[PDB]
Amino acid sequence: LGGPSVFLFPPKPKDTLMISRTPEVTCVVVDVSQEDPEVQFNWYVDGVEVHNAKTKPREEQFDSTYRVVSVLTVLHQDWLNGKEYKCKVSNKGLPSSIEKTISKAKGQPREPQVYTLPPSQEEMTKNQVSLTCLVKGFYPSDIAVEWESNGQPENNYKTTPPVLDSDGSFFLYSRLTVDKSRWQEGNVFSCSVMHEALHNHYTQKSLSL
Amino acid sequence: GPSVFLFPPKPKDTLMISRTPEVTCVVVDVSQEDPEVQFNWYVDGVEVHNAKTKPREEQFDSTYRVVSVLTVLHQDWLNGKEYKCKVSNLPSSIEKTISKAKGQPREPQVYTLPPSQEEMTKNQVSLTCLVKGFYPSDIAVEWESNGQPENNYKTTPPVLDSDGSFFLYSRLTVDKSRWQEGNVFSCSVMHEALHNHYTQKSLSL
Incomplete structure (x- = not known):
């Protein structure tokens, strides 16, 4: 059916192993309609909500659709302990809120x-x-x-x-x-x-x- | 609706004259109410007819899968000849081409x-x-x-x-x-x- 799509990407392996770098879990939604562009994110680490995420403004694709990206900085030891990371996306172009989980x-x-x-x-x-x-x-x-x-x-x-x-x-x-x-x-x-x-x-x- | 995939011959089949290389045209998601499928093969624009077509195998999906296989000449593929596959399942046919x-x-x-x-x-x-x-x-x-x-x-x-x-x-x-x-x-x-x-x-x- 019609509506935006939600992807959730893991940190770069190198960022995970080096403490001088910054590991990130990224939630990116695409095919966001121009008629309903407002997008809200909700992040959870093993069920507990975090608020330190950084959401970049809506980037208009070539076909008048929009791409929104929310990036969450994770702790090296947290990611390696197998803690689960959830991304919840709310939008009018979607029939309901959609949750993706990565670990x-x-x-x-x-x-x-x-x-x-x-x-x-x-x-x-x-x-x-x-x-x-x-x-x-x-x-x-x-x-x-x-x-x-x-x-x-x-x-x-x-x-x-x-x-x-x-x-x-x-x-x-x-x-x-x-x-x-x-x-x-x-x-x-x-x-x-x-x-x-x-x-x-x-x-x-x-x-x- | 149904979709088509086209696959190249295995690298080993194209090099060893003992084996015989083949291009494979796959049709999936064939509705149970329309399983009749015809194939058309083309080599550099020229149509060939030496292809063998497997029967329509049914899937769990209640849709069907039809597979066509064309034998190709070893030197033909090594020279960059183009192999096109036209599928018609109705003036709406899908073409795939590989070389x-x-x-x-x-x-x-x-x-x-x-x-x-x-x-x-x-x-x-x-x-x-x-x-x-x-x-x-x-x-x-x-x-x-x-x-x-x-x-x-x-x-x-x-x-x-x-x-x-x-x-x-x-x-x-x-x-x-x-x-x-x-x-x-x-x-x-x-x-x-x-x-x-x-x-x-x-x-x-």
Whole structure:
């Protein structure tokens, strides 16, 4: 039937694991009619209502409909404790109030094993080589992977999405492309992995020649 | 009303001449009061007739599902020929059209990586096969050992790189004793940009 639609998005995994960042649960409604644009939000954390949400003004889409977004800042420890977050939306374009609920992935968390793999000797003929970081056996799939060397971050890398393995855990690979000289000259490269099952939600493994 | 989906042939079917690739046209949500459906297939605008149509299977939904399958020529799909499917269930027909991804093929580099020494403390180890610098993303990866096929592996999806090419990883899990006894493992990769559409890289202790 006709009327607006309500979506509720979880925080970025990286925002959850780092305390220097800010994890957010976002409730966004679309297809809000111009004839009835006024939208009210109501947030609940495990049934208890919170009021610290920040609602952005109605943005008019291309087709005269409106998009309204309400964003709620959550606590790192709260989200990881599995606390449920509810978003209730009230609008005249809807026959009734609609509630959506989101929470952390359920299931026993498993610590990721991190292994660094040196380049293949065959790839040593090309100008740049591939440093590989294998992260496996972790649960849930929310994870973050970065690269560092000499303190400064190396930003020339890509990371495959989490893949479900036979034992119900995930695995992925991260590939950092470096100039051969920097690898031949014996520099130390560190694969950084962040995950809720790790000690202090962080670990790193070095890789050199 | 009913809706139509069109699916490409499996990447492995298009590369190995032994297998036969097929495009599949699916029609769902067919009302019980109107199950009569006709299909029309077109190759680069030219209509073909060598397609086989499965019977109307009923769903729990009290609606029906009709599936049409067209056999395609291996070289046709590799050249970018367009396959269109027209469905009529009444002057209101729905068209769907699909072909191979546009662009110049780039052959993949295959590198076999041994398990990290830190993993030797576990009962099973990981054999890593890196496939990079290929286009398009259509690719297939398998594992063999002493001729016999290995099945305990998992392959990541193709990941788009910076130079407009793709890369992926494939990870085979074997018992540590298998690896320690110097058994030979090989990573096989089938891609259109490879000579004979096939290459293999060995890996052992």
